[PDB]
Each structure stands twice: as structure tokens, then as C-alpha cells.
Design a protein around this ligand. Sequence first.
Ligand SMILES: [Zn+2]
Length: 257
Amino acid sequence: EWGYASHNGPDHWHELFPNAKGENQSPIELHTKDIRHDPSLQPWSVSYDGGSAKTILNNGHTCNVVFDDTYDRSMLRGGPLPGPYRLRQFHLHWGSSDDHGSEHTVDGVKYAAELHLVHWNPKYNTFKEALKQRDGIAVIGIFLKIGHENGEFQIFLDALDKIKTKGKEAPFTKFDPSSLFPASRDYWTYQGSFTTPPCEECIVWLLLKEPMTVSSDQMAKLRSLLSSAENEPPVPLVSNWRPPQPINNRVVRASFK
Ligand SMILES: [Zn+2]
């Protein structure tokens, strides 16, 4: 009961979800000349377990890989976080050609897709209870820039064949999504929200300066997925990005000089 179209677009989401219109929404524009270095930002680390992966779904907005988080398994730590955090899911956001598709922008500059890795604080007992904290979620954000094929990313792409359609689920194990990471772990950090409804203001963002490169033909395989079940009328999922919301008075810090 929401969408990226023209009667369900993001423009309207608040008509049914009213966080959608709070003071800490994501995504944002990042204006590098308004951003300062903070020398108290440490680096982050992951311990992930490739065996945590379970399923891959197409929920009609996006493709999801789900992981097992019933205990402390694949862990994100350091950075600005207070504590260690659990991996739960990743997905993506894209548009309809390569010149655009990311949610965040950096000095105007748009990327072709954004990858989001979702984590949650064990301190808050439960993914669902952490949606009510300001720092309950942690997202690692990655940009996708056109280029050379990515092989670890293919692994994932190959599986899309089995969920083409909204609804569809399939098994997906043994994938470590740290494989996708680029070489640098330089980061921008801010506080905001989920970009899809219900738009909870739950998120510590960690955006990575460095883009993971991918192929145009890799990108058009993501662009194939569809948003109608089988028994129903085709329709492609051609865009799924949300446009930048208001910073108000929010401070964006960089890990890096
Ligand atoms: Zn997302």
C-alpha cells in the first residue's frame, strides 16, 4: 500500500504514514562543503557469517536478502555506534538509467543504485523495539557506479531469476555481503530514517565514500524484476528511490579528511 509511481509515490506516503513527514527523514543531500571531519570517528568493522544468509525475497518494492538474527551472528561494530549491532537484511534502490538511481546524493552527483545493509541493536531486545529508538538501526550505505563487472555481485544476481515477481521467495545461503565492500571504509554519518514506509526515525547512517563498481548489464538485471505477482499483469520495478528530504538542522560528519 505504497509505491514509487504517481498516486502512491512518496509525495503521498504521509497520507497514510505520518512519520513520513518528520524532522529527521532520509535520505539527504550531502553538501561536502557543509560537512566537517570529526577526528573522534573511529573505523568500523564487520564480522559476518556467510552461513547466516537464509532467503531472498522480492517484496514488490525491492529485492531483499534476509539473514538470521536470532542471536549475535553477523556483527557490525565500531564507528559512531555505541555497541555492536546485528545484521538482518540488505536490498537496493535504483532508477531507470544509469545516470541516476541512488537515494543519497553527494554534491549533486547521483549514482545508479544504493545498497543498504540493515542492522539493529541487541540492547533493545528486538528489531521491533529498536524501531522506536533513535539509534536502534544501523545502515551501511553503498553507492553503485557503472563500470566493470562484479563477480561477488553476480552470485546475487543469478538468484534473481527465482523471484522475478513480487511475492516470490527462495533460499539463499552462503553469501557474505562483505564481499561487496569497497576498499576504503571512509564514511559519512548522520541520524535519520528508513526511506520506505513507515519511515521510522530509527537510523544511524554510515555512508561510504567509495562506490562499488558494477556493469550496465548487471544493472539491467536488477531493472527486470517486476512488481506484479505471476497471476497478474506484468510491470517492471524501474525505480525505487526516494528523493531527498530536509536536513533541517542536522549535522553530517565525515570519517575522513
Ligand atoms: Zn533502503
